[PDB]
Write a protein that binds this DNA or RNA. Sequence first.
RNA 1: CGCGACCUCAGAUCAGACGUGGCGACCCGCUGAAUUUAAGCAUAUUAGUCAGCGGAGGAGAAGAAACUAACCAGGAUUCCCUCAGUAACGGCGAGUGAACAGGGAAGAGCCCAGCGCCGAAUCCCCGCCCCGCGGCGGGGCGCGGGACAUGUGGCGUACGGAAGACCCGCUCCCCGGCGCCGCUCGUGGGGGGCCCAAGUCCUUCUGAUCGAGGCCCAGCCCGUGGACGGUGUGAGGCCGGUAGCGGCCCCCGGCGCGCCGGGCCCGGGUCUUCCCGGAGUCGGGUUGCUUGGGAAUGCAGCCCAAAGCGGGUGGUAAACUCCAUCUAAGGCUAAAUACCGGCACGAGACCGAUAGUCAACAAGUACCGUAAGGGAAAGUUGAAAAGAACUUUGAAGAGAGAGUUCAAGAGGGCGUGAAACCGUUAAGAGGUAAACGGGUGGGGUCCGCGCAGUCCGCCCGGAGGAUUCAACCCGGCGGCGGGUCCGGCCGUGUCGGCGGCCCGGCGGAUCUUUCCCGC
RNA 2: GGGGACCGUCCCCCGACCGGCGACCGGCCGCCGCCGGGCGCAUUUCCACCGCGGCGGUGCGCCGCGACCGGCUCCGGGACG
RNA 3: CGGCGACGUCGGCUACCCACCCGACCCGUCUUGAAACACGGACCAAGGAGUCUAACACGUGCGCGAGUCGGGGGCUCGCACGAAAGCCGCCGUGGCGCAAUGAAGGUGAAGGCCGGCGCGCUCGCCGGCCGAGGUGGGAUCCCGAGGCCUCUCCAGUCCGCCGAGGGCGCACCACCGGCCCGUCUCGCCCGCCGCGCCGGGGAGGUGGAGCACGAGCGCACGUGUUAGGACCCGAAAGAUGG
RNA 4: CGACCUGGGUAUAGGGGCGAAAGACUAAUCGAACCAUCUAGUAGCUGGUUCCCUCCGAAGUUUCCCUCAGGAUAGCUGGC
RNA 5: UGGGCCACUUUUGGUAAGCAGAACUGGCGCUGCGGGAUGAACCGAACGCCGGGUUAAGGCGCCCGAUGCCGACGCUCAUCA
RNA 6: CCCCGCGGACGCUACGCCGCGACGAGUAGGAGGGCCGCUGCGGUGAGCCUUGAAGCCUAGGGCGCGGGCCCGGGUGGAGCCGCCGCAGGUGCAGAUCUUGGUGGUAGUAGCAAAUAUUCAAACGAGAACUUUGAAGGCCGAAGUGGAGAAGGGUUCCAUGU
RNA 7: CAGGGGAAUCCGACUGUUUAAUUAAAACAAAGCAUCGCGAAGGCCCGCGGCGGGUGUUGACGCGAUGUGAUUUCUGCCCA
RNA 8: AAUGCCUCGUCAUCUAAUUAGUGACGCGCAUGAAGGAUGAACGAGAUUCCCACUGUCCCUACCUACUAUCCAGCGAAACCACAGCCAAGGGAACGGGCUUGGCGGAAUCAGCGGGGAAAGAAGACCCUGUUGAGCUUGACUCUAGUCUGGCACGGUGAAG
RNA 9: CUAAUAGGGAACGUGAGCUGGGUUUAGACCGUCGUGAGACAGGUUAGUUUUACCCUACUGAUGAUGUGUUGUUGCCAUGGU
Lengths: 210, 147
Amino acid sequence: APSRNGMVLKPHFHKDWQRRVATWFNQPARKIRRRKARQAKARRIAPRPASGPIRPIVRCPTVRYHTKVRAGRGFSLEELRVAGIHKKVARTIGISVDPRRRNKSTESLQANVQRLKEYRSKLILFPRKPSAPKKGDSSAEELKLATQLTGPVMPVRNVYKKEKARVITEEEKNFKAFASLRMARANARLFGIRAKRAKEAAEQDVEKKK
Amino acid sequence: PSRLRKTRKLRGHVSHGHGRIGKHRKHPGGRGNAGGLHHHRINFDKYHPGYFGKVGMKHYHLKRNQSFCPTVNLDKLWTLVSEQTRVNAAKNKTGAAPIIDVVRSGYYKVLGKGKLPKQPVIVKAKFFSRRAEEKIKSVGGACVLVA
RNA sequence: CGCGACCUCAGAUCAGACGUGGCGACCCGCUGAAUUUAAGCAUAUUAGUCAGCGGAGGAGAAGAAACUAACCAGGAUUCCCUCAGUAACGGCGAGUGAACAGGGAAGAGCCCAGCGCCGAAUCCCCGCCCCGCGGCGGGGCGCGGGACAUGUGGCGUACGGAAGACCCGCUCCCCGGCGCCGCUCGUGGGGGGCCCAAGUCCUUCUGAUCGAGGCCCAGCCCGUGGACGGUGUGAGGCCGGUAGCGGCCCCCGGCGCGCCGGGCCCGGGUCUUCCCGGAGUCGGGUUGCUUGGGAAUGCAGCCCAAAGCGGGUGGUAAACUCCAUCUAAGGCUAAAUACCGGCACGAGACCGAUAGUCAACAAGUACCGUAAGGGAAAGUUGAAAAGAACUUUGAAGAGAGAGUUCAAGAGGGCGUGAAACCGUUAAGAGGUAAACGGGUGGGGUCCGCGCAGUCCGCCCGGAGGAUUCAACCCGGCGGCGGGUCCGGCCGUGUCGGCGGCCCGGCGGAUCUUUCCCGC
RNA sequence: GGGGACCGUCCCCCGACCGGCGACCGGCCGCCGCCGGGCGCAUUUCCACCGCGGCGGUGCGCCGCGACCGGCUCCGGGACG
RNA sequence: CGGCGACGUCGGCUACCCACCCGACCCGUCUUGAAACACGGACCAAGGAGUCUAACACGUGCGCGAGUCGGGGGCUCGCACGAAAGCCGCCGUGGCGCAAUGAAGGUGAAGGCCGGCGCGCUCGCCGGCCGAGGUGGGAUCCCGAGGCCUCUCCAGUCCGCCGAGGGCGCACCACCGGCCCGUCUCGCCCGCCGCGCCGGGGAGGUGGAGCACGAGCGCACGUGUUAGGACCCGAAAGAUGG
RNA sequence: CGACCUGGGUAUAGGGGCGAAAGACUAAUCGAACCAUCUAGUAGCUGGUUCCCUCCGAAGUUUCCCUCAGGAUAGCUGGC
RNA sequence: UGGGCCACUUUUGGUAAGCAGAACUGGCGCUGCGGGAUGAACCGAACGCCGGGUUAAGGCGCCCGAUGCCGACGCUCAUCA
RNA sequence: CCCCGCGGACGCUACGCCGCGACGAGUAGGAGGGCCGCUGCGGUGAGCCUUGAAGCCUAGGGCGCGGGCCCGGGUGGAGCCGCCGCAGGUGCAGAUCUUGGUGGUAGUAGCAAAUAUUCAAACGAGAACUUUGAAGGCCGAAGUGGAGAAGGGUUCCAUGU
RNA sequence: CAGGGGAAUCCGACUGUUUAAUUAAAACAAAGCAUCGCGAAGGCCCGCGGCGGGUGUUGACGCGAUGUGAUUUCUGCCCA
RNA sequence: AAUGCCUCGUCAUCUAAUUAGUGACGCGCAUGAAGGAUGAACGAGAUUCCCACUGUCCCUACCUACUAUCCAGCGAAACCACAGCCAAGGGAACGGGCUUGGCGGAAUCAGCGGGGAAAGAAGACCCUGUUGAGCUUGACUCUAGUCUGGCACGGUGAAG
RNA sequence: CUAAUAGGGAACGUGAGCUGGGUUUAGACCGUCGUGAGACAGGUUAGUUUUACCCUACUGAUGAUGUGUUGUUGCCAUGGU
Ligand SMILES: [K+]
Ligand SMILES: [K+]
Ligand SMILES: [K+]
Ligand SMILES: [K+]
Ligand SMILES: [K+]
Ligand SMILES: [K+]
Ligand SMILES: [K+]
Ligand SMILES: [K+]
Ligand SMILES: [K+]
Ligand SMILES: [K+]
Ligand SMILES: [K+]
Ligand SMILES: [K+]
Ligand SMILES: [K+]
Ligand SMILES: [K+]
Ligand SMILES: [K+]
Ligand SMILES: [K+]
Ligand SMILES: [K+]
Ligand SMILES: [K+]
Ligand SMILES: [K+]
Ligand SMILES: [K+]
Ligand SMILES: [K+]
Ligand SMILES: [K+]
Ligand SMILES: [K+]
Ligand SMILES: [K+]
Ligand SMILES: [K+]
Ligand SMILES: [K+]
Ligand SMILES: [K+]
Ligand SMILES: [K+]
Ligand SMILES: [K+]
Ligand SMILES: [K+]
Ligand SMILES: [K+]
Ligand SMILES: [K+]
Ligand SMILES: [K+]
Ligand SMILES: [Mg+2]
Ligand SMILES: [Mg+2]
Ligand SMILES: [Mg+2]
Ligand SMILES: [Mg+2]
Ligand SMILES: [Mg+2]
Ligand SMILES: [Mg+2]
Ligand SMILES: [Mg+2]
Ligand SMILES: [Mg+2]
Ligand SMILES: [Mg+2]
Ligand SMILES: [Mg+2]
Ligand SMILES: [Mg+2]
Ligand SMILES: [Mg+2]
Ligand SMILES: [Mg+2]
Ligand SMILES: [Mg+2]
Ligand SMILES: [Mg+2]
Ligand SMILES: [Mg+2]
Ligand SMILES: [Mg+2]
Ligand SMILES: [Mg+2]
Ligand SMILES: [Mg+2]
Ligand SMILES: [Mg+2]
Ligand SMILES: [Mg+2]
Ligand SMILES: [Mg+2]
Ligand SMILES: [Mg+2]
Ligand SMILES: [Mg+2]
Ligand SMILES: [Mg+2]
Ligand SMILES: [Mg+2]
Ligand SMILES: [Mg+2]
Ligand SMILES: [Mg+2]
Ligand SMILES: [Mg+2]
Ligand SMILES: [Mg+2]
Ligand SMILES: [Mg+2]
Ligand SMILES: [Mg+2]
Ligand SMILES: [Mg+2]
Ligand SMILES: [Mg+2]
Ligand SMILES: [Mg+2]
Ligand SMILES: [Mg+2]
Ligand SMILES: [Mg+2]
Ligand SMILES: [Mg+2]
Ligand SMILES: [Mg+2]
Ligand SMILES: [Mg+2]
Ligand SMILES: [Mg+2]
Ligand SMILES: [Mg+2]
Ligand SMILES: [Mg+2]
Ligand SMILES: [Mg+2]
Ligand SMILES: [Mg+2]
Ligand SMILES: [Mg+2]
Ligand SMILES: [Mg+2]
Ligand SMILES: [Mg+2]
Ligand SMILES: [Mg+2]
Ligand SMILES: [Mg+2]
Ligand SMILES: [Mg+2]
Ligand SMILES: [Mg+2]
Ligand SMILES: [Mg+2]
Ligand SMILES: [Mg+2]
Ligand SMILES: [Mg+2]
Ligand SMILES: [Mg+2]
Ligand SMILES: [Mg+2]
Ligand SMILES: [Mg+2]
Ligand SMILES: [Mg+2]
Ligand SMILES: [Mg+2]
Ligand SMILES: [Mg+2]
Ligand SMILES: [Mg+2]
Ligand SMILES: [Mg+2]
Ligand SMILES: [Mg+2]
Ligand SMILES: [Mg+2]
Ligand SMILES: [Mg+2]
Ligand SMILES: [Mg+2]
Ligand SMILES: [Mg+2]
Ligand SMILES: [Mg+2]
Ligand SMILES: [Mg+2]
Ligand SMILES: [Mg+2]
Ligand SMILES: [Mg+2]
Ligand SMILES: [Mg+2]
Ligand SMILES: [Mg+2]
Ligand SMILES: [Mg+2]
Ligand SMILES: [Mg+2]
Ligand SMILES: [Mg+2]
Ligand SMILES: [Mg+2]
Ligand SMILES: [Mg+2]
Ligand SMILES: [Mg+2]
Ligand SMILES: [Mg+2]
Ligand SMILES: [Mg+2]
Ligand SMILES: [Mg+2]
Ligand SMILES: [Mg+2]
Ligand SMILES: [Mg+2]
Ligand SMILES: [Mg+2]
Ligand SMILES: [Mg+2]
Ligand SMILES: [Mg+2]
Ligand SMILES: [Mg+2]
Ligand SMILES: [Mg+2]
Ligand SMILES: [Mg+2]
């Protein structure tokens, strides 16, 4: 029964919850087990980066996150084409590729290809037969500089352009920010109905004289 | 700690604090929010007005991200830049005003609560309230919109 | 009017294979309540849950968009955090209730049909020989059979593909062994076997001791071992173990090299010419169920029934219009995830024999029910049986002696051995049932070192001893004070910054090559 | 993209003044105290015994009695207005 | 101040038995009312009933504080303890708080004084300052005439106490103004790359879980309410499968 | 001597059977058997609810309720 | 807690009721104690454990504390006082 | 300007100690304190203990308003407790409570359906009940006789206890 | 061993059956009488389902569904 | 009348006496026709009277068997707050306890049925519960099965 | 018939005293009521009456306390009548 002031509470405990309760007593053991698997995987791919393939620079979708950049699934086929990497060779040298991603703008395309070209420069390639190096790399640097990279390969990094303090022009001071937003909302709201009324007036003008 | 509770003090007292006449029974009055319009009407009306009935238009598939527009007031505006930025502008001889990008700091709309220090500043935001724009221009600043 | 080919069927204890049934904690496909809540109750809730049926595996399922979105776009599946008790559903009552984006764990992609090209290039079976056995493969041979044009194989699948030219790069794959590595790895990779420190020192306690004192040299000895268990106590050094990138022995697996048997066969860029798709399916109506999905989320039945600049989706039904996004009606796929059953382990602020599993034990046993099914009670002598020889009464059970033991006032349901209840002994009492509260009295068992009843400070007197009492000298150590007497300081400022982006750091939403590496 | 400059906090130093030696410590002095060793070897000091000694404190082994003082109370005489 | 003290006595209100006087009905429970001819209770032993999770609310304690919080993940010989502890900082994504209001489109919280001017038209352009107004209360604090002192006086040297009055006023309370969002009534202006069925502004009422120089977040404890077996035991029933 | 009595074998199974009919019988159970499970079903109703001392200390009234053996609400109480 | 009940007085229904229903204050419930022999509610008075004194209401033949006063004045005889 | 005396009680776990005044009923209920009590964990007691732990018994000595606690004696035979914190499956007279045990009833009700036993002997420690003999009775062939089915499962038969 | 008898009233015709474990009856059944459905692609009934199953190895002198209750004598009026 | 309230209806018969029985009457609360009215035989069916018979009774007695009883052996259970002598009082209005009085004498045996508001069972009557179940029905809401229409399986020819 | 055939109480005395005719379960018939299940202070018929051995009360039966033991013969308190 209700008793004095309080919050009307609606607990969801009418459905025999006690038979489906997930305890977390294996959480410390689970963290240990994944960490052993991470260490075992890193040893298995001895010189290859532990985190895995290089991932592309990706802008987050919605209007909440579209100022923020993250890592994506894989580089686009267009990104690989202008970077000069075959889409079937890239996965063999640690480049993740997403066949189903398109590049709607050039800036995103152009930013990711510099990521690929720069990664290609940083890449040390071991010959398939160590005795006979065809086109892998010079043995001088592949011997000593070969080290398993820890963490994500070239971590995706949100960069902010620093704006230099400047003198405010009179044109900037005369701009009406609030009025522009209010007028822009009205223009977008009445665009369709204004065209219809203009069209209906056009039909009146083609037959004004009769 | 169970040693600090009333149960340890209610041993030897037959009704355990619930009373001899009324007793402690399973569910007198119903279970949960039972009888909110019937035998519990006064409590619901007294403490939870508006509980019963529909008001307004429903909207299927609401996406909270589309309406994402955090706001910042003018009194907190200068906290978005470093303290070096504001002293340098104040002691600057020229009319050079620093740029505050509230979108970079995580805000989209600039609201106009409070007052600004008497020094010009360029404020970059997605939206401005009418009074926030007026106060920024009063200190000789400018408002420029971003998308 | 017989003989052949094919088609569709049939029989066989035909040659060789496969399925069935069990377990079922976790998983997949169905079916599916009511108790209950709503203070009644029918929709709702319980719940897509219990029960019922089927099917798996070490995981399963899902899974590489007929997606999310509407952004400056993301990009298979699965799991965690959050979104969020929110959007929404709901006698809009009780109640119910996701998703996207974001951050993580993990991360892996692919294959057909179709369209085409290639002398069916393809596959199974049976005999013969060789290399082998270790789950039965490889090679060679057969005017040896069969499958298959009612379509096998290679190329190729929307990320476009193919064929021709032109140019460039010759670039290098996967399989089973021979001998040996690095010795496989946080220092063995795994499985099994056998081993590796130091007191039973002296004196004592005891039934027994693992107890208590002691062990000169900074201290009994070892300690990378002071976890645990056993042993007559309570043990780091008595024993097993424990520690150790300790030792030895046996067995098994994938990792690189030289060789071997065989396969192994062109890749990219430009241009041109071609080629491009899953139908009683989608979609629509309706019905029933389901969902948060609300003029209908999904699933299914019936009816209708497609198209190809088409089709689906774009969370309010509909027409027109633009736009975005994907490409259904075929298939596979590891990881992160689940696990009250099983094998083998480790641990615990849990329980301690009416507790904890029903079950600490000949427990799913005894026992009950025709059956489905129901289902207990029950641990402890002692260190060691040393488990009472022998004598005596009795027909014996049972006794009296004796004996073992530290103890039988531990004697085979025997550690301790409460209360209720009973027998006997002792004391007291007794016609208002006992019992009780308050107040005394009598008696009794005990207690009080009870029984000539305190101690100790100063002074006085008497009778004895001992240094040495005070004050001075030497040495040591403390307390307090001292303009810092001298330092070492510390707190706060004070300047040259000698001092740091080379000869000291970390930060800044502060300015810049107007000396330097990408447009 | 670097590398620089500047700013804010730092750093150990070269140095002075400032408040104090502090509960951050030493050396010197001064005073005091304690201890050890000498000297002091007796009208000093200390130790133990005795007195049925005195002064104080505590308390009497048990059972009793008395006295005065103060608090509360119940009564009784006498006298004055 | 007196008496008495070892094999008989001395003290022990407790504790054992007995006697007498006074008082005294059997507990628990429901109930207006129980000793009840109201129910349960023959006796003893052991067991036996407000718990845990989640969610709220308020109070209290702790840390930090316009912030707070790593709980999910990751890094640290991989592990006696340790499944602990420590660390992350471009792991703070995110939660809660820092802004409300409206069904929604949306909008979204600074005033006071001094001056010249239109006309200081209940008013529009500026200047200068200060930065959430005012009234009445208001702990505390500040000033304070006049007093309190010495063996005594002419004359002040230093501070201490009391002190009528006066002042600044915390928190908080009452009230009056002001500001934001919704909605009415009235009315006149202003803006332009879109001259519009465009955009903005004013005055006066009224609706809001608002502003008006933040108080929250995390953790712990207590109490209360609730969903769960829900303090413990208890139906007549209903369903599924045998 | 009969719609007679009786053994054994068969068939009918739970909202079902079987009944010359009594709601009879269906394994001592029948106006819906028995067993296990859902299930610790729900109960405004009955019974119980375990140590001590100290301090404070009630109500059976108001309003609303398919409310009248119950709640909500105000009142009375305690704590801070 | 939301079953109340009782008493003086006021008061409605009823023949009436230890009945039913209101008002006001007090009480019992929740409360022991002195008195009413006995008794939830009457009268007195409310309570920590005690010693002394004094009272309340009520009593003072005996039970049973207190008149065992040379108490005062009357009234009354009952073979159901 | 202490000094023939160099000296002068106790105190103040400040969560402590001390002073003064008033007050004290209580169901339901609320709160505080508990050096009340049980079990386990982290610390601590150079804690206790085979020269005797826990438990149990006790006309033994005491303490506290009380919950309870300490000590003596006996029994027992291996463990246990104090203090500071922590955590509960933490306190019983009741529930026609659960399990186990034990009373009064009480040496009582009772050992009464179907006619019936008696004598002698044997074995034997022991004879109303066994065996043998003798006698008197009963079932009376629709049996208290002789054999089977179902069901039971060794009850069958010897010997012994 | 082994019927007391007679005169009547009510009910059931009779024989039979029935509430195992309080009712043996006047209750049920019965023969007789009456009514109704149905010619099989059917009537009545079972069945989750099959053109499944029972009556039915049946066919109106038969199956199925009711009421009344031997014989005798009657069975009136009302289709709103 | 097994059907009549009024009702023990009225009249006759049966008896000394009949709320009983039989016969008769009938404005019959509320008889009646697939059930009415009769009628032999039959009935562990309900009722009345008569003969006979008797311990049913007046009015009780005696006898027999087995018990009970006593003994040897053996040996429960129900129930149990504590218990157990009364009168009155008051009291939850019927006390074993309390008040006032009457009084009260170990341990027991055979009986007994006044009390213990004796035991047996959480009253089955009655009421309450927003607790059921069996059954009924134009209660509400459904449903198997059935009747009917439509679509599909579902075709080939003619008269219209 | 008689002298008279008075009225009442004792849990409307008395069911572990009986009986079970009535009322008041379940079977059944009739009448009335109800659509029906079913109902009827209407009629009718058939329908399990359990336990004492406890305490007291009462009835009888042994005994018990005091006169030393034991016996004979007696008295009468009290109760009944
Ligand atoms: K309470
Ligand atoms: K919601
Ligand atoms: K071929
Ligand atoms: K070893
Ligand atoms: K459909
Ligand atoms: K499209
Ligand atoms: K058990
Ligand atoms: K078992
Ligand atoms: K022993
Ligand atoms: K009772
Ligand atoms: K964390
Ligand atoms: K935050
Ligand atoms: K909003
Ligand atoms: K609860
Ligand atoms: K079963
Ligand atoms: K037969
Ligand atoms: K059933
Ligand atoms: K009522
Ligand atoms: K309240
Ligand atoms: K209330
Ligand atoms: K300890
Ligand atoms: K105590
Ligand atoms: K002991
Ligand atoms: K016959
Ligand atoms: K019969
Ligand atoms: K048929
Ligand atoms: K008929
Ligand atoms: K009709
Ligand atoms: K008709
Ligand atoms: K007839
Ligand atoms: K008969
Ligand atoms: K029933
Ligand atoms: K007399
Ligand atoms: Mg209480
Ligand atoms: Mg209790
Ligand atoms: Mg209670
Ligand atoms: Mg309900
Ligand atoms: Mg309910
Ligand atoms: Mg219900
Ligand atoms: Mg299941
Ligand atoms: Mg299978
Ligand atoms: Mg799979
Ligand atoms: Mg799949
Ligand atoms: Mg695809
Ligand atoms: Mg939220
Ligand atoms: Mg649901
Ligand atoms: Mg990752
Ligand atoms: Mg092909
Ligand atoms: Mg060793
Ligand atoms: Mg050991
Ligand atoms: Mg050891
Ligand atoms: Mg080892
Ligand atoms: Mg739409
Ligand atoms: Mg057990
Ligand atoms: Mg035990
Ligand atoms: Mg024997
Ligand atoms: Mg012993
Ligand atoms: Mg023993
Ligand atoms: Mg004894
Ligand atoms: Mg009760
Ligand atoms: Mg009552
Ligand atoms: Mg009582
Ligand atoms: Mg009574
Ligand atoms: Mg009761
Ligand atoms: Mg009991
Ligand atoms: Mg009882
Ligand atoms: Mg206990
Ligand atoms: Mg950690
Ligand atoms: Mg954020
Ligand atoms: Mg103010
Ligand atoms: Mg105001
Ligand atoms: Mg609350
Ligand atoms: Mg139901
Ligand atoms: Mg329960
Ligand atoms: Mg239950
Ligand atoms: Mg209502
Ligand atoms: Mg009640
Ligand atoms: Mg009540
Ligand atoms: Mg009331
Ligand atoms: Mg009244
Ligand atoms: Mg009343
Ligand atoms: Mg009460
Ligand atoms: Mg009171
Ligand atoms: Mg009182
Ligand atoms: Mg009194
Ligand atoms: Mg009186
Ligand atoms: Mg007194
Ligand atoms: Mg008197
Ligand atoms: Mg007297
Ligand atoms: Mg009190
Ligand atoms: Mg418990
Ligand atoms: Mg108990
Ligand atoms: Mg006997
Ligand atoms: Mg007998
Ligand atoms: Mg014979
Ligand atoms: Mg025979
Ligand atoms: Mg035999
Ligand atoms: Mg007959
Ligand atoms: Mg006839
Ligand atoms: Mg029969
Ligand atoms: Mg019968
Ligand atoms: Mg019979
Ligand atoms: Mg006839
Ligand atoms: Mg017939
Ligand atoms: Mg007649
Ligand atoms: Mg007669
Ligand atoms: Mg007719
Ligand atoms: Mg009496
Ligand atoms: Mg009694
Ligand atoms: Mg009852
Ligand atoms: Mg009952
Ligand atoms: Mg009700
Ligand atoms: Mg029902
Ligand atoms: Mg109807
Ligand atoms: Mg009577
Ligand atoms: Mg009887
Ligand atoms: Mg009687
Ligand atoms: Mg009768
Ligand atoms: Mg009857
Ligand atoms: Mg009718
Ligand atoms: Mg009659
Ligand atoms: Mg009969
Ligand atoms: Mg007898
Ligand atoms: Mg006499």
